Amino acid sequence: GAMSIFDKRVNYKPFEYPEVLQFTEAINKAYWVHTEVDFTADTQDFHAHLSLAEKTAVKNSLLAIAQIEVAVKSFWGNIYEHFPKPEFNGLGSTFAECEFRHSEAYSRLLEVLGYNDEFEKLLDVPVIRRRVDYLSNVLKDTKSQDNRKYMVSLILFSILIENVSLFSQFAILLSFTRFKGYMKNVSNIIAWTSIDEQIHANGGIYIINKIREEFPDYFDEETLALVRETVKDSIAVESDILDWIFEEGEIESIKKGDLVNFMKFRIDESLKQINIPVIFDVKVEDYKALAWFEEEVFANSL
Amino acid sequence: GAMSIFDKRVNYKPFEYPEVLQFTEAINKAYWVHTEVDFTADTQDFHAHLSLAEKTAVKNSLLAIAQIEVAVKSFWGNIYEHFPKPEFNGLGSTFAECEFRHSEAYSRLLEVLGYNDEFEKLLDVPVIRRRVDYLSNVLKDTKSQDNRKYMVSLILFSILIENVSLFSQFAILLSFTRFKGYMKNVSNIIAWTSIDEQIHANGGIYIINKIREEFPDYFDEETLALVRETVKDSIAVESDILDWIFEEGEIESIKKGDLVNFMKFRIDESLKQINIPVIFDVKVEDYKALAWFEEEVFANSLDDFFAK
Ligand SMILES: [Mg+2]
Ligand SMILES: [Mg+2]
Ligand SMILES: [Mn+2]
Ligand SMILES: [Mn+2]
Ligand SMILES: [Mn+2]
Ligand SMILES: [Mn+2]
After folding, report:
1. Which of A8, A42, B100, B207 has the fewest CB atoms within 10 Å, measured from its CB?
2. Where residue A90 sits, what CATH number does that domain have?
């Protein structure tokens, strides 16, 4: 059979998948650590200027982010086990190192704002448990030796972990800087993280599309239906998380309904990129509510 | 049994091994890539100003470095499988990413100087085959679940692959910049690599000493004897590699004999740091010859943010 992404190549170069360097180069240019940032102004703003509803939203957003980011994340560091090419060990290790810079950043934020205790007991929160049990279950095949099962796990990983499960919280936190001028340093971290995650998702999409090019029959009706139904179930889970984030009431800078449409639009954009039929078909008026997101990310990255 | 470095800890913090962050922060602060660096003047130096003996010493040194660096290197990225702590997944992943920056840097150098053909046929060189055969023994237990065997693989990996195998070649290349002002940007790459590799070696040493603290009986006479004899055999291989590097004759900027003592000194210093008896006992006047190595590396790494 013809050489494929699953087959070992021994020689370093030429790369069979040279576009890998577009993603590693993007990470290189965006390289950042949290020690570059002082949160004294943000802590003061948090305690002195934010309402109870705003304090709760900020706290629960960061706790939700940390549930994903403050962890040992082995996926990217292991893609070479499935795609045994020098360039994918490179891509994998590059993204793996990023995740440690992320875990350290969000661990510091938890320390600085005084939420280590609440983070430690976060599995007491039922909506978090459901997200964990959802994510555990649907991403079970990230360690499968079966390449078809693994491909599906990569689709879901790229959609859920690198996008759906984070970006609503990123949006919430950036909204405080955009509309109220608060949490500027926290928003620095959030903006840099969102840039990295977008690169991670885009790298995932790249790999998925290469597998599709090489093995079109992996993308049969049964597999497409599994992905779509699994992705649908994320909405319920993440929508309940927003109810918990806003458990002390709605806030001025951002609204839940717009965040739900934001999530749905981002899902559909990812599905189109991998030739899977859209699920939600969000109307322009609805997803434009948070169209400021990209602009604000760019602003707080500088 | 008490919690050890080999036992899984689930919670992220506090770290049981917080000194990990000294190593990751050092790598973070030194972060560099090859992509903004250009070698037009270096290539002109190479062709216009170097004798055949110097050209060949440079070429063969780069080929020897590339033999180790231009490869898929999985060790660091897998230390979490052996030390299942969040901080060691962090250390491992940080050092793993570094190795891809290195492989890309040396792949670029091979291209720029036109050595791709020779690199592809490098196993035709007997001393290189001997090095591969020998490195295969350092790496042989690096996937072992036997923690004593894995520990020995880590010792050999740290003191040979990270702190010695490359350093004679780094010194050769730096000597052209130090003594004649040539090949400045190649020396930038070399110096930045040397800094990273030293951090890798020191991170390995840190781990080895934690294992020694927790499991003193792993360092029994049998184990010490194996390490010391394995390391001795390395010298012979690397000394032969030097004969090949300088096959066209001795050059002005650096001497083979000094490089051998430099290597022996570096080995013994590493062995002392992990409480293993020294092997070579190198004279003060002998290791003084390449005492400049550290300060040249430091000099070539100063204020290079935009270059990096
Ligand atoms: Mg691995
Ligand atoms: Mg074990
Ligand atoms: Mn992340
Ligand atoms: Mn990610
Ligand atoms: Mn290296
Ligand atoms: Mn190294």
Report:
1. A8
2. 1.10.620.20
